[PDB]
Amino acid sequence: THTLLGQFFQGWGTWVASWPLTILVLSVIPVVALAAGLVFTELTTDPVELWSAPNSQARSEKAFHDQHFGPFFRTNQVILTAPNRSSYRYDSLLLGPKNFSGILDLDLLLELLELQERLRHLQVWSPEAQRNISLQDICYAPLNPDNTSLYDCCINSLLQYFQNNRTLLLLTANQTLMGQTSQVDWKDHFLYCANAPLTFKDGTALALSCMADYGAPVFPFLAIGGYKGKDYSEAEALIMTFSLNNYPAGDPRLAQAKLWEEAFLEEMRAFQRRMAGMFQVTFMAERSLEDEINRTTAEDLPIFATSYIVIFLYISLALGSYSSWSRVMVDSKATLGLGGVAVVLGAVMAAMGFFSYLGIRSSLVILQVVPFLVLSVGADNIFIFVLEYQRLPRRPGEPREVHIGRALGRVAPSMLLCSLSEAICFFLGALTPMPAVRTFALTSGLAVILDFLLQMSAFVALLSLDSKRQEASRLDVCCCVKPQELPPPGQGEGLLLGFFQKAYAPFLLHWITRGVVLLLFLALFGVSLYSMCHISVGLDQELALPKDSYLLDYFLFLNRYFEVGAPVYFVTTLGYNFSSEAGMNAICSSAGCNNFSFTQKIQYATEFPEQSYLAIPASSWVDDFIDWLTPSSCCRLYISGPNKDKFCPSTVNSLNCLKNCMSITMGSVRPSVEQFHKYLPWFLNDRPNIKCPKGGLAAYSTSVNLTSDGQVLTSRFMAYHKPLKNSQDYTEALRAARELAANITADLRKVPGTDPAFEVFPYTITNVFYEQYLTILPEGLFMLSLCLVPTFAVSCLLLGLDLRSGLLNLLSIVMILVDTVGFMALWGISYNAVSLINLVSAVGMSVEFVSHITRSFAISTKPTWLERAKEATISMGSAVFAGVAMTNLPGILVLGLAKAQLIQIFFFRLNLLITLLGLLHGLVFLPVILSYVGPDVNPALALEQKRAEEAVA
Template structure:
């Protein structure tokens, strides 16, 4: 019995019974309905406070030893409260993850030559500076969009830092490791060497950063608010990260290099060590391993065939699995482990005999006062057999039709009558809140029990189909406006509506993100169409394989997964673009030799010497941070951040370090004639300089040592020629410079 005196349906009050035998019910269902208001309405805060006090009371009762039965509970604000609580509890996990990545980057960047120089050769300050550059980039992006009024979200705070850190770590590795392997030329200053190295690696860094930034800006064209907001924040953060690395990080590396050249310890700059740094660059252990073993084995004739077959088979299998991926996000996945909401969802699916209520709302434009209008709504004898209520099977007895004046006069009494034996159709409780002085109204029904995202989405779709059918039928009634419409409303529609269009929306966004990766690669590689297509094809394979593994690992496709897939496109650029550029700049004769050179990192293009070493270190740095997320309390983070990001990183490394070199060895572009011509000119220039220096050295020997006509002034350290010797002035200057060089070496 309801509080207004009328009976209620058994499926609304009890649960856990079979058929209609509700006397054997195992659960009692109690619902408190509150009036909802807009967020700017003062009464909204009152309703929120009521729910807060309600949760406190039931939580205290549940913990009381006097409680003699088990119950589960929730309020409308419970979902938001639990998600916020989870975010606060998992902040330390994210901090630990960033700390692990920082330690890994700092250790991996060090060029350790002896135990005595560990504190000198370590790169903790450089690693910390790289992390700070990433943090400043994210904060700059968040500050700008907050200033112009673009809202943020939980996903942005969790995903964007990882994305920018992936890009930032990649650029840090490629820049710092390239500098460490470079030899300073004779007479070259430290700043000049850093500038020369930066000139070699900056095009590759620009290629990746610009591709990703444009990729995310195009992703902001999405109609999904979560994806649009994420794309805007990520695009600006990646762009700011590149700008700060080209300025602030370069300055930081210059200062750290000065400290290292002076043999000063990193944490105690006033302390110096006597052990000098070796003149020969340290290759480490990965570079010789890749050059001597990995590249020859990978690009062996039979190995290449096996690699192509395996990856093509994996791609085809992922295409098949992609059509079987589950779409949706169950509410319990957003809850932390141990949340009271998990018990509520468990009991909901177990005991509830009915689904959520659904309202079919009629907009203005329908004449309820006419006979045809009422027949189009009612469901009793004499009504239209295709009326609104008959279509939704909400049958009631059709009372005698009053006149318009009588209807308006008796309507208030009807809405105030309590249902009883004499008048079971009294409107109090059932219709009094539904009738207001407005041209719209609603008709309530119930869904069947719904237990997961797929069922909620299917119910929403069917409700819309039914509402459209009703709309078309009621528009045929005379006096109905052509704009009249009936639409369904359920409190869960706001959440599940996104899944009606998320598949085409995702395809559109990912396609937009793939476009700049192709265009930018072609432009920065000198309109190299083939390299751009191979780059694009590999990124598509990584994305498709990611979706395929999602199906196997029970990861649903939803807005959070779509954001990670967009991120996967950006991260994939880091794994493939450097290899493609290294291959395009190689001047070897055959494709296999050029692929081996690019893979072994010993190519003529200085900026690509550390390509695969950087790729390995980048992948390991991401994995070290991702593995920490496995200990998060929120299932949402464990599934969509730990599992999905681990999949993206592993597939990116596999395609970038295994599949792409083999693909380039078969279908890569030909030798770049412009690069080959430039290399030949540089080689010819070097040979001429070497020959000229050799000739001048012979002249110096003949004049200075054999005939004793050139004498060395020990006081001034200069070479003097007698006045009777005919030596051109320019030749004398060259001889003097050569003499100074020989004296310096002596």
């Protein structure tokens, strides 16, 4: 079959080389026709569309939550710090002596208030709507979602304990406690506020409302950070959150939100530049990450394009035999250099163009990796082809077309194998759930296919033309000048083969050396296979940003100073009869309720924050419901008048509704079905007031989805994760949450009237991204195995290699792959979808190092093993080194300047490791193991290649 592939491609080659210009045109036309599709290019920017499997479990849970409770609100945080403010001890006289941190001075808070106020009235032009968009237009309103004003928006900060008032900030009073009088400043109100945030009266000789301005209580962990326990006075960082309403991707209100985000960021930059010796401000925005990941894609693309020039120059200098110093301008192959560069460029542009035509949207990874990775991969074929064509002695009375045909006939099977291996590996790597990596893998696959299809026709035609110009004895590049005069005839023995045959093969295959490299490589494999255990699964968050971003400093401050992570929502699906007694009983935490209930289980889970990643208990609407219906004059019906048995609000103080909400209470308050269905809309729409603090409008406004009938479809329970720092922490948090939710569902399903398809799932904002790393190692190992099977299967058929050769091929690919993973874990590169696609690219690439040497050893006729190993290395080792290694290095070493830590960490470093291990193995380890336990050569492998050359002449 190998001989038939040789004959086939020889026939094709000798045809194409006979008709160069026509086939050049016939190959250029479709390339331009496909490359024309780059005007249809659309870049996806949102991390949700890039780093999420669309049909995954977390996405289904997100879609459900988004449908039943609206989308998760956007958050625009600002974290301050006092760098050079030590402390000042102060006694409140009612909580004892307290050491107030430097950041909680008066002037610093007045400056924060000034900033907050200036940020409330801040507006954008909004050139779409042509009107000034104020905060009230788009801001998240937990209370009063309609008729929203600048005093009705979700602005969480320490200055919410004074409702954003300068007079209440500068307010002092005199309090006599057990005979001794002292001054009560804002400090005592803050100290009282931090311990119990849901109080309408302070009660420390100051009638100050601890409740927030917008009218829903602010928790201490949302306004201050850096403390440990309940020593809030020692808070090291103030926090300020301008929460905004989120919309689907179609709504222009989202574009208006993004514009307000941009103006917020601008104001925050101005404030950061203003305060130098006072504050150390860091900020973010919902659009910040999307803008930061896609900033460097354009700023660093021109710097990468120089790799093409470096490879052009290298190819031009590494194929031209300069052995006269008078005809260097006749032998330097600049035409083939331009050819090779134009071929790769055509291939990558055609691939991108074709994928743009189908309306498949590109990304940062595609534009920044594909043109250079495909360039590193797709020059080696041509390089080996030209080197073989140069090394072939032309038979007497043979035209150059048949000579080029014969050269292509010799090195076609190896090139086809390498191309097919790379293509297959990329198209199998494309089974990743991440759309970004999927698109990237498919692009690289098609690019390699088109590259090979161009290398077969376009480059062969151009080599035929270049060779024709050589035969006419005309200038190296500028053929128009023609022969200078009478260049002396050129014949050489090769400098590469010279150096190799003199130095390398004698030194490498020395009796002493072979043992040294064999024990060294066995030891290296052993160390690698040990060091594999110290791997870190999961792509990091801040490591996908540029190294000069402000989000780095923000995430530093977040991970350092914050006290609770993202809020988890234990969303209860439909098919639960909450109108029952046992239904409400099994969600309850208070007395007169069953043991180990929903909220009791969450309350118990949050006891050990290490083993279960919840640092705050669940805020349950049903417990606060049964607490609201307690006869404490919260809910009241009219004893007389036109509105008989209708809810009089807690705010009215008239006698006309002195009737309690429900009947006599001796045990536990449990409403009947009618009571439940009647009182639930009254609970959910009762704003909390001074007369009684319980109310559904504060926290549980949109936490229960009610139909027009009055039945509860679905309800969500709010809990806060502990501060999550690493990708491991978040993965462990998701896993622990899911486990707890499943455990809770197991107890909820046993209640009578529960639909068996009823489920509780712990939804968060960062569940869509970090859920893959639960099940990435099995998928990864399966994919690498499914890539290593067909590579070897096809390598043992295309080349026609013996079992011993194919087995050593597979062993070499396994050894390099394990070594790569070992050094990956050793460097400090994590394992994820990007590392996975690069390891699959490594499986695809390693054949270019192994197969050529293996084949060159297989097809031999030297008497003993050592002479075969010697000649095989010299014949191919030289070709494989000069081609593969020195075309891989220029295209990859440029990605070291990426400035986007994602690329610079996961592409440059990993591909460098793969290329150097490829070189080491395929040049040092393979010749020695082939010299030792290589296959037994038979004459009927080389004497069958002559029936293929003259027969198809």
